[PDB]
Enzyme design. Structure first.
Site, PDB file in Angstrom:
ATOM      1  N   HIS B 800       0.847  -1.184   0.000  1.00 41.70           N
ATOM      2  CA  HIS B 800       0.000   0.000   0.000  1.00 41.70           C
ATOM      3  C   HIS B 800       0.889   1.243   0.000  1.00 41.70           C
ATOM      4  N   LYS B 809     -10.252 -10.275  -4.760  1.00 42.65           N
ATOM      5  CA  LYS B 809     -10.090 -11.218  -5.856  1.00 42.65           C
ATOM      6  C   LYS B 809     -11.448 -11.768  -6.286  1.00 42.65           C
ATOM      7  CE  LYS B 809      -5.397 -11.894  -6.060  1.00 42.65           C
ATOM      8  NZ  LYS B 809      -4.969 -11.058  -4.935  1.00 42.65           N
ATOM      9  N   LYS B 860       3.768  -6.560   3.882  1.00 41.69           N
ATOM     10  CA  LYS B 860       3.987  -7.745   3.070  1.00 41.69           C
ATOM     11  C   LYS B 860       5.080  -8.577   3.732  1.00 41.69           C
ATOM     12  CE  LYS B 860       4.728 -10.332  -0.800  1.00 41.69           C
ATOM     13  NZ  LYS B 860       3.862 -11.452  -1.178  1.00 41.69           N
ATOM     14  N   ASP B 908      -8.786 -40.732  -9.649  1.00 42.86           N
ATOM     15  CA  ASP B 908      -8.083 -41.035 -10.879  1.00 42.86           C
ATOM     16  C   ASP B 908      -7.194 -39.847 -11.216  1.00 42.86           C
ATOM     17  OD1 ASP B 908      -7.861 -42.814 -13.363  1.00 42.86           O
ATOM     18  OD2 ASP B 908      -8.858 -41.079 -14.325  1.00 42.86           O
ATOM     19  N   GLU B 993      -5.347 -45.596  -8.001  1.00 44.20           N
ATOM     20  CA  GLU B 993      -4.557 -46.419  -8.901  1.00 44.20           C
ATOM     21  C   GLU B 993      -3.285 -46.843  -8.178  1.00 44.20           C
ATOM     22  OE1 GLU B 993      -3.499 -44.479 -12.613  1.00 44.20           O
ATOM     23  OE2 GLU B 993      -5.205 -43.078 -12.462  1.00 44.20           O
ATOM     24  N   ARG B1211     -12.173 -43.510 -27.039  1.00 49.96           N
ATOM     25  CA  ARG B1211     -11.740 -42.238 -26.488  1.00 49.96           C
ATOM     26  C   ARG B1211     -11.291 -41.310 -27.615  1.00 49.96           C
ATOM     27  NH1 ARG B1211      -8.414 -41.163 -21.034  1.00 49.96           N
ATOM     28  NH2 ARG B1211      -8.883 -38.935 -20.917  1.00 49.96           N
ATOM     29  N   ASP B1248     -12.102 -38.839 -18.509  1.00 47.99           N
ATOM     30  CA  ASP B1248     -11.412 -38.870 -17.228  1.00 47.99           C
ATOM     31  C   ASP B1248     -12.364 -39.389 -16.150  1.00 47.99           C
ATOM     32  OD1 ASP B1248      -8.758 -38.252 -17.977  1.00 47.99           O
ATOM     33  OD2 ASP B1248      -9.026 -36.086 -17.716  1.00 47.99           O
TER      34      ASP B1248
END
Ligand SMILES: [Cl-]
Ligand code: NA
EC number: 3.1.21.1
Lengths: 97, 1292
Positions: B800, B809, B860, B908, B993, B1211, B1248
């Site tokens: 600042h 944001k 900061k 996955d 997996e 696919r 996916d």
DNA sequence: CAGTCCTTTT
DNA sequence: TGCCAAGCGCACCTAATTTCCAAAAGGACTG
RNA sequence: UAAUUUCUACUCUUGUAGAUGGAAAUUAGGUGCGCUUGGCA
């Protein structure tokens, strides 16, 4: 503006021609004089005036070199050193720039 | 029955909490006056200098022992061979036993208990070893017995700097035992010799054998390589690959020599590298002759050995000497640049290149080795120049142009250096121009660089960039000159050859400079590091016990909801140790912790009774009992029976379960077990620290199965915490006089303005000191806490300046984020500095943004802008439980058999999603499905990809690299959070997996974090006393030990093979059964076609149907017959369909490879095209296949088969369009082909998602087969064939 | 020695 | 737009696996 | 375009949400750059 012809092939019409590279020039917008003596502004372009989206009735005079000078000084990029401007233009990903 | 809430208090979990310490009163002043920070920083530096010096002791002794080792490796080899060929439990256990034999044999050399040496050496060794992990290091005795080596004054100054403070190294001692251990641990020399390197060395022997059998010419080639390398002169290549030589490969020096036989030796950059065995093999394969295929079909790559623990590496290859300062590099390069100026290299070079315009281009040659580099530089592709050369030569041949002639031309082009006249003739005048242009650039940039002055330091990145570009330019010229073949084999123009070689020699140092500059400039600068504080107390905060407060100097306080650390330093003057006197709890003051702990009974009890010196000294020459009186209210009897019980000759003790395994004495086991427990209880009743502990909760000694079960119940009783009040006066004066340093233990949950939920760690800590926990211990405070000082590492700069506005944001939504591409624009706009007109998209968002003006200056990186005191303190949760669980997986499996309604979460790793989840119910229906590329409205996948590219860019630009592990954790923390909520909400199994069957890092990191979390799961919201609260953590995974020891189950977490989870029809279980590698010729494709029963058109639907029986075309299949005997494969009419949201797509569309990029393809349309070109009638419904075959048009056959393959490509992906769908080529029972493009939320929404879904379903396979089994044992993996058969039967 | 306090242990 | 294989050198970043998480026995110092 | 034991994401809130096992030792690997001999139709 230096362009190698064996480059950015995705946007080319597929017409390499004979030359490997071109030095594209933004001609300084100074006054030149024809043989009769009439003045004209070098590097001047005549481009369609565009209303939002897609609307083009009339045309307008553009001076690329001067507008580039405008855009660089806007963003405080130093250019009279002779330095490469391209990295500096897309270093921050400004969409307008 | 069992319950989900029954997954708690099954095993202890240890954690470290981290806090800031805020000094109170005059504490900081006293610390400064006494100069403790500097003193402790100085110790740290002394530790770092000394460590390598001390390490010299271990390195030498280890090598001295390892030089004498001679074993026979046959038995270990055999055990390895057994377990490999036959994969049984008994062969495993034999290998494990043998492994441990070999380790102990190596270890016997270190401890002086090996029969392979004399009694004198074994006496010397055991004597050295006896002093390696004690302060005997620091005295010189161990160095006195080791060599006539000695230490310099400076080294002695360091050694004496740890006088009365050698305990600073007590952790180091452990780290070094971990080197000489005989245990099966990674850190240990024996393990490295036995289980790491020997297998490799064995495998190498096997490879050598099989290779020189198939190809005996190699024997001498390999011997020749060894000759060329100049190592192992007295050992033939055969002996090098024989087991006895492995005794000569235990020391680093020899391992590196071995590795360089495989590896080769590099000289200066630009010179030919000496090839090792692995290169010679690779070269031989790439010749593609017959010898190549023989070698390619064998194992053709020797395995280098890992290094010996601790040892310094050595290399025969050239090492470039380093620059030491900014100043040194700038001077050197500045001189080299001046040389290049005075030498006139750029003006020569330009003259040379001009020469090319008017000289016989037949007498200028281009190196065969550079032809492709030049191609890329001057042409569109790397193969342009080769191809033009090829095609031109072909055109020049005489007679009928046979295939052998073309072959001959191709072979000529591989080796031959091509003249410039031929290159130009073949490629065109365009090439001449590209050459001239390129030489101009390179000379232009080189000139620019020599003129451009150098910077004054390399302290800023802009300066390093000046340096980098100048080197780049010079390297460019060096590269250009190295285009030309200069050797005297070719008929090169004599002048050209001399002049080029001249300036090449002047430019050669550019290489050396380039490398050295990079190696220096890319170094990371010394960043400040926190260092351990001791406050002149060698055992600072080693342990909290009341009896140790006077030695360890650390105590804890509580006052009005705040926590303080009391440190009692040893000041420079003479001061009486600080004493604290309790008072009535009414008086104002601080509540002090009285911590009362008797550590692990299993060790402490023997330490204080049986293992005493006097006890060992008595039983050495006596059999009569000994009565201990000291620290016993009544005497404890040690009988010979008891002593011998804990002090056997035999390897297992009579009361350990290992004696029960080894022998068959269940009587004598339980009898020994009872007498030992009995004796422990006798100790505990009498010993001063334990006599007052009520042990009535313990059972009768006889009822304990294992000693562990006993000690598990016992330890929880042997730790107590209470508080008493100390008066304000005592504490404040203590601080005043400097006898006490008082710190508030702090985190942000203790801020004046804290008003939210606390950190989980805060909850653990407050739960620790909660009344409930004091009364019944769930969380224990552990010893070995540490204090650190962290110096400021950043400069104060407020985020600042004046009346700045800060842009949230997110919009007023408190949900929708502002695009990254718009933020800076909107930011500059609201602070009136835009410099241009606002964009339309920014102007649209403008009404819904939020700003905050800066009233309070916030700093900061504030936390790093001033020195901080830090405090790490360990705790243990589920303290009532054993230290490790028993049969954790069986308990889950028991619960699962009684809960068949349990849902499954499939997880996955995707191609376009980092992580994808699909939750299924117990009937295999999808509950939920989503990509986790975005959590909490933030696209982590984009952020990660961008940060990865920056890091690469940095590396290439000699710029600061930085870290990405923090961003990864940031992300995975959010992911872990969401999986945990899903598990709890659904009471669900999780399935991942197995990665043993790229971006595998982010998913590996996930696996780890998920298990660690589920080892001890506390949900902030839950009350402390509710299961899932802080005093009853959920424990849903098995205690993590190592990934090595991990199986296919860790409690509620399951691992399944990834194959056949994405490219598989969710409605049928169909998979493409064919191996397209085995379809390569007109012959193979035609046999392939003959295998299908019919292909015919259906006028009703517009589709073609291709009928296949799985029993045909076996040659072309993968040996996976699945469950279905036949399939009707379908070419879907390429018609418009509409998804749920109302967006259309074209049925049956495929996306096939181009590599220009991908191409859209409509099979059914294209089939109609083919048939119409060929004039083959099909609209009647007839079989098309005989007609395509009888015609025997190979291009029609090819097309047909190309089309079939496309149809079977379920696919279909295109990053550009964002398509990644599954379209099945087979109709499900209800007569419809699956297409994810329909966007039916009952089913996988994309490829996916389909992956996750089938990951989950493989888990379901495990749960179904578990139920049917009469055991609590999960099946070991899932074969692809079992999977396919399962899912195909289920779906149809 | 007798006590203190670092070292080493189960 | 060119990658890939085998390998050597340098810079730094990342992950896996071991020990400890201790009161008290033991004994080296130090008047 | 900011506050943290520390990390990530945030800013109604001088702070919010989630996560967070440290320290020491060792080993293995990755990314990038440079270089060597080769391979690709
Ligand atoms: Cl798959
Ligand atoms: Na909070």
């Amino acid at each position: 503006l230096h362009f190698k012809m064996n480059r950015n092939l995705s946007f080319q019409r597929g017409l390499p021609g004979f030359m490997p590279a071109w030095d594209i020039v933004f001609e300084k917008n100074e006054t030149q004089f024809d043989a009769k003596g009439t003045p004209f502004i070098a590097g001047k372009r005549i481009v369609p005036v565009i209303e939002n989206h897609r609307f083009t009735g009339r045309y307008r005079d553009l001076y690329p070199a001067n507008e580039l000078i405008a855009l660089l000084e806007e963003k405080g990029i130093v250019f009279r050193d002779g330095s490469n401007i391209l990295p500096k233009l897309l270093e921050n990903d400004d969409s307008h720039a | 029955m069992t319950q989900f809430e029954g997954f708690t208090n099954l095993y202890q979990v240890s954690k470290t909490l981290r806090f800031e310490l805020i000094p109170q009163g005059k504490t900081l002043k006293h610390i400064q006056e006494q100069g403790f920070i500097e003193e402790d920083k100085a110790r740290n530096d002394h530790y770092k200098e000394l460590k390598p010096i001390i390490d010299r002791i271990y390195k030498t002794y280890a090598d001295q022992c390892l030089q004498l080792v001679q074993l026979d490796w046959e038995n270990l080899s055999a055990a390895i061979d057994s377990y490999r060929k036959e994969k049984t439990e008994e062969t495993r256990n034999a290998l494990i036993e043998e492994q441990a034999t070999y380790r102990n044999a190596i270890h016997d050399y270190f401890i002086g208990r090996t029969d392979n040496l004399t009694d004198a050496i074994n006496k010397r060794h055991a004597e050295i070893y006896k002093g390696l992990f004690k302060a005997e290091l620091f005295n010189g005795k161990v160095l006195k017995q080791l060599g006539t080596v000695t230490t310099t004054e400076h080294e002695n100054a360091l050694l004496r700097s740890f006088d009365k403070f050698t305990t600073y190294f007590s952790g180091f001692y452990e780290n070094r035992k971990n080197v000489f251990s005989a245990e099966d641990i990674s850190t240990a020399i024996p393990h490295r010799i036995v289980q790491d390197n020997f297998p490799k060395f064995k495998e190498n022997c096997h490879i050598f054998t099989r290779l020189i059998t198939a190809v005996p010419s190699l024997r001498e080639h390999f011997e020749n390589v060894k000759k060329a390398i100049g190592i192992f002169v007295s050992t033939s290549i055969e002996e090098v690959f024989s087991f006895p030589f492995y005794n000569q490969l235990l020391t680093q020096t020899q391992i590196d020599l071995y590795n360089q036989l495989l590896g080769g030796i590099s000289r200066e950059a630009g010179t030919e590298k000496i090839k090792g065995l692995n290169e010679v093999l690779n070269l031989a394969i790439q010749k593609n002759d017959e010898t190549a295929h023989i070698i390619a079909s064998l194992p053709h790559r020797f395995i280098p050995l890992f290094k010996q623990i601790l040892s310094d590496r050595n290399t025969l290859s050239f090492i470039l000497e380093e620059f030491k300062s900014d100043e040194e590099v700038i001077q050197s390069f500045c001189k080299y640049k001046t040389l290049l100026r005075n030498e006139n290299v750029l003006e020569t070079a330009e003259a040379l290149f001009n020469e090319l315009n008017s000289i016989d281009l037949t007498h200028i040659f281009i190196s065969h080795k550079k032809l492709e580099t030049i191609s890329s530089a001057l042409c569109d592709h790397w193969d342009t120049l080769r191809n033009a050369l090829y095609e031109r030569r072909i055109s020049e041949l005489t007679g009928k142009i046979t295939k052998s002639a073309k072959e001959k031309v191709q072979r000529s082009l591989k080796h031959e250096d091509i003249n410039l006249q031929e290159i130009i003739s073949a490629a065109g005048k365009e090439l001449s121009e590209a050459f001239k242009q390129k030489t101009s650039e390179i000379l232009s940039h080189a000139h620019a660089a020599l003129d451009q002055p150098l910077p004054t330091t390399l302290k800023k990145q802009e300066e390093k960039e000046i340096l980098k570009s100048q080197l780049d330019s010079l390297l460019g010229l060096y590269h250009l000159l190295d285009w030309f073949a200069v050797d005297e084999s070719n008929e090169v123009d004599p002048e050209f050859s001399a002049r080029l070689t001249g300036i090449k020699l002047e430019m050669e140092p550019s290489l050396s400079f380039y490398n050295k500059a990079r190696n220096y400039a890319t170094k990371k600068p010394y960043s400040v590091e926190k260092f351990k504080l001791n406050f002149q107390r060698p055992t600072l905060a080693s342990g909290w016990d009341v009896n140790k407060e006077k030695n360890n100097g650390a105590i804890l306080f509580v006052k009005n909801g705040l926590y303080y650390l009391g440190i009692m330093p040893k000041q420079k003057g003479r001061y009486k140790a600080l004493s604290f006197e309790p008072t009535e709890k009414t008086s104002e003051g601080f509540d002090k912790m009285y911590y009362d702990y008797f550590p692990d009974a299993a060790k402490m009890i023997p330490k204080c009774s049986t293992q005493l010196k006097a006890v060992t000294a008595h039983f050495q020459t006596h059999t009569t009992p000994i009565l201990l009186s000291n620290n016993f209210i009544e005497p404890l009897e040690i009988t010979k029976e008891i002593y011998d019980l804990n002090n056997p000759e035999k390897e297992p003790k009579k009361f350990q379960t290992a004696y029960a395994k080894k022998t068959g004495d269940q009587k004598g086991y339980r009898e020994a077990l009872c007498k030992w427990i009995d004796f422990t209880r006798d100790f505990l009743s009498k010993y001063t620290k334990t006599t007052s502990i009520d042990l009535s909760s313990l059972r009768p000694s006889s009822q304990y199965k294992d000693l562990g079960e006993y000690y598990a119940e016992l330890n929880p009783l042997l730790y107590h915490i209470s508080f008493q009040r100390i008066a304000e006066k005592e504490i404040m004066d203590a601080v005043e006089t400097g006898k006490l340093y008082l710190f508030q233990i702090y985190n942000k949950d203790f801020a004046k303005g804290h008003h939210g939920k606390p950190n989980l760690h805060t909850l653990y800590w407050t739960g620790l000191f909660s009344p409930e926990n004091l009364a019944k211990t769930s969380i224990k405070l552990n010893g070995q806490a540490e204090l650190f000082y962290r110096p400021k590492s950043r400069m104060k700069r407020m985020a600042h300046r004046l009346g700045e506005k800060m842009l949230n944001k997110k919009l007023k939504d408190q949900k929708t984020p502002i695009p990254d591409t718009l933020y800076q624009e909107l930011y500059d706009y609201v602070n009136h500095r835009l410099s241009h007109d606002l964009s339309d998209e920014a102007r649209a968002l403008l009404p819904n943004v939020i700003t905050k003006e800066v009233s309070h200056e916030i700093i900061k990186d504030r936390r790093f802008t001033s020195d901080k005191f830090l405090f790490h303190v360990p705790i243990t949760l589920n303290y009532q439980a054993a230290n490790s669980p028993s049969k954790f997986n069986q308990r889950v499996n028991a619960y699962l058999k009684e809960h068949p309604e349990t849902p499954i979460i499939g997880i996955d790793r995707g191609e376009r999603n980092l992580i994808y989840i699909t939750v299924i119910d117990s009937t295999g229906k999808i509950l939920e499905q989503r990509s986790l590329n975005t959590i909490q409205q933030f696209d982590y996948q984009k952020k990660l990809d961008n940060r990865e590219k920056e890091r690469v860019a940095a590396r290439q630009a000699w710029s600061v690299v930085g870290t990405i592990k923090d961003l990864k954790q940031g992300y995975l923390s959010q992911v872990i959070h969401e999986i945990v909520d899903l598990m709890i909400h659904y009471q669900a199994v999780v399935v991942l997996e197995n990665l043993n069957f790229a971006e595998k890092a982010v998913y590996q990191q996930f696996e780890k974090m998920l298990i660690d979390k589920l080892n001890c799961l506390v949900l902030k919201d839950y009350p402390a006393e509710k299961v899932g609260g802080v005093l009853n953590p959920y424990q849903l995974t098995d205690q993590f030990t190592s990934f090595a020891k991990m199986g296919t189950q860790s409690g509620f977490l399951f691992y399944v093979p990834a194959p056949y989870t994405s490219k598989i029809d969710p409605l049928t279980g169909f998979v493409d059964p064919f191996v397209w590698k085995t379809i390569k010729n007109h012959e193979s494709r035609k046999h392939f076609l003959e295998g299908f029963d019919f292909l015919h058109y259906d006028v009703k639907t517009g589709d073609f149907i291709l009928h296949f029986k799985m029993n045909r075309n076996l040659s072309f299949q993968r040996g996976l017959p699945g469950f279905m005997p036949a399939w009707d494969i379908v070419f879907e009419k390429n018609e418009t369909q509409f998804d749920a949201k109302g967006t259309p797509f074209i049925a049956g569309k495929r996306i096939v490879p181009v590599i220009e990029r991908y191409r859209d393809l409509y099979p059914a349309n294209e089939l109609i095209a083919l048939l119409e070109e060929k004039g083959i009638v099909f609209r009647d419904g007839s079989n098309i296949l005989p007609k395509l075959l009888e015609n025997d048009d190979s291009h029609a056959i090819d097309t047909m088969v190309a089309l079939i393959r496309s149809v079977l490509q379920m696919r279909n992906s295109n990053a550009a369009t964002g398509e990644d769908y599954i379209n099945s080529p087979v109709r499900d029972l209800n007569g419809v082909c699956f297409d994810s493009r329909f966007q039916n939320p009952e089913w996988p929404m994309d490829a996916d998602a389909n992956g996750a879904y089938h990951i989950a379903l493989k888990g379901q396979l495990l749960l179904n087969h578990l139920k049917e089994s009469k055991d609590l044992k999960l099946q070991n993996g899932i074969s692809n064939q079992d999977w396919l058969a399962y899912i195909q039967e289920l779906r149809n």
